[PDB]
């Protein structure tokens, strides 16, 4: 890192006000229809959101037992922002190691825990369930068939990006990025807190972001200082944060924290979702860091819209029969 991260946390120059403060009961489908989910949202309490979370004192070791001690987990080396791997037992040992005895800074932001015992302990906001493409567009018998709790692509039967557990030690930093496929993201601070820097997806900012990705000078440049307006905001314990498609953001962890969150595509911000996918294409993002089965999903979206509006199906007879069997349950 060729810049000083502590001055970015202290300065008052990231003074934009992009985030709308909202009540949970107002975050409904009508709200999505009216606004297109274009504004970052903070819900200071969870009332009316329909979320559920684990035991308040749930530990990383409890996560381990849910997902499997020998499960391989993707870990971020904070200093290089490169990916490494270790088992969940090893990660847990790291998280439980005293700060002084940890010779490296590591972050877990990508533990997707669907199809484990943890999955039923976390419920997403109700409104996300109404609009998420995975739940509403992907063939249901395929999604229900998923047995693999890892994100092994050859076993993956649908885009397995719904429910992630993030485990971050004091001092972790995730550099500026846009979430894969232009997904929107919800984030619940179960324990601890986070600091986000937010940059809006204007044409100019997206151009800068893409050039920054292509430049090979990313550890060298703090993107928040290259743009006209950037908001630094702190998320406290119990907050729920929603980030729209395309938003360029970086995240710092001021204390040991446990977060639950997830990604979703939806039908009301498609142009930006496609814009982000094309940036990934041009900057040669490896497949593993992308939204699985993105264009497949897009095809299923078109089919669902034609079917729900016109009652004309473009699925194969076998997929139609699988769907009717689901309907008879």
């Amino acid at each position: 890192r060729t810049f000083d991260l502590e001055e970015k946390l202290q300065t008052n120059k990231y003074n934009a006000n992009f985030v709308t403060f909202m009540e949970g009961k107002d975050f409904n489908v009508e709200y999505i229809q009216r606004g297109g989910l274009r504004d970052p949202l903070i819900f200071k309490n969870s009332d009316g959101l329909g979320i559920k979370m684990p035991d308040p004192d749930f530990t990383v070791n409890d996560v381990k037992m849910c997902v499997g001690s020998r499960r391989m987990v993707d870990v971020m080396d904070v200093n290089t922002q490169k990916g490494i791997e270790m088992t969940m037992a090893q990660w847990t040992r790291y998280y439980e190691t005293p700060e002084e005895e940890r010779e490296k800074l590591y972050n877990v932001i990508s533990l997707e825990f669907s199809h484990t015992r943890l999955e039923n302990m976390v419920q997403r906001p109700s409104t996300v369930d109404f609009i998420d493409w995975v739940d509403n567009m992907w063939p249901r018998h395929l999604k229900e068939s998923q047995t693999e709790s890892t994100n092994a692509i050859l076993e993956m039967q649908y885009p397995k990006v719904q429910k992630y557990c993030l485990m971050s030690v004091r001092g972790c930093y995730t550099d500026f990025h846009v979430d894969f496929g232009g997904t929107s993201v919800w984030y619940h601070i179960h324990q601890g807190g986070k600091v986000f820097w937010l940059i809006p997806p204007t044409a100019h900012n997206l151009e800068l972001y893409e050039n920054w990705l292509l430049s090979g000078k990313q550890g060298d440049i703090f993107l928040g200082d290259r743009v006209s307006d950037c908001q630094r905001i702190e998320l406290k314990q119990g907050y729920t944060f929603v980030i729209p498609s395309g938003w360029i953001h970086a995240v710092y962890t001021p204390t040991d924290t446990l977060v639950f969150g997830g990604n979703f595509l939806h039908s009301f911000n498609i142009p930006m979702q496609l814009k982000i996918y094309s940036i990934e294409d041009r900057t040669r993002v490896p497949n593993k860091f992308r939204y699985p089965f993105y264009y497949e999903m897009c095809w299923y979206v078109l089919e669902r819209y034609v079917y729900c509006i016109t009652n004309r199906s473009h699925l194969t007879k076998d997929f139609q029969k699988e769907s009717l069997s689901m309907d008879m349950e």
Partner: peptide, 11 residues
């Protein structure tokens, strides 16, 4: 070494 998808990481 199974290939994975949907890994969250800055590029």
């Amino acid at each position: 070494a199974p290939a994975t998808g949907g890994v969250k990481k800055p590029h």
